[PDB]
């Protein structure tokens, strides 16, 4: 499936099985634009997080309960949700994915 394929390709499951990972299907510029949108607090308490005004297309990749390195197995769940990312640097761009509502 898409998750097992993209996780491997992006060097995410080549040397380990990462429990979860979300892929955003919007242009990179549109995602970077979120850093100037709705300012909220990151679950960790920090406040350099921003929620997207609109929902975006995303694919949630979750490891099955059976997955074990080297045979990682993922469950693919497509959806449209508001993304929340932590921004920093100059330019101000996303460095962490916080959640999706």
């Amino acid at each position: 499936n898409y998750c097992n394929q993209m996780m491997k390709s992006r060097n995410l499951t080549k040397d380990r099985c990462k429990p979860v990972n979300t892929f955003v299907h919007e242009s990179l510029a549109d995602v970077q634009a979120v850093c100037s949108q709705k300012n909220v607090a990151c679950k960790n308490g920090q406040t350099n997080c921003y929620q997207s005004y609109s929902t975006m297309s995303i694919t949630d990749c979750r490891e099955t309960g059976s997955s074990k390195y080297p045979n990682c197995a993922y469950k693919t769940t497509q959806a449209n949700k508001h993304i929340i990312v932590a921004c920093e640097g100059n330019p101000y761009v996303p460095v962490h994915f916080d959640a999706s509502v």
């Binding site: 990972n21 979300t22 242009s27 694919t59």
Partner: peptide
């Protein structure tokens, strides 16, 4: 090598 913004792109971007 890989900056934090670069890593976010490799890990989560799939336009």
């Amino acid at each position: 090598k890989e900056t934090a913004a670069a890593k976010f792109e490799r890990q989560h971007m799939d336009s």
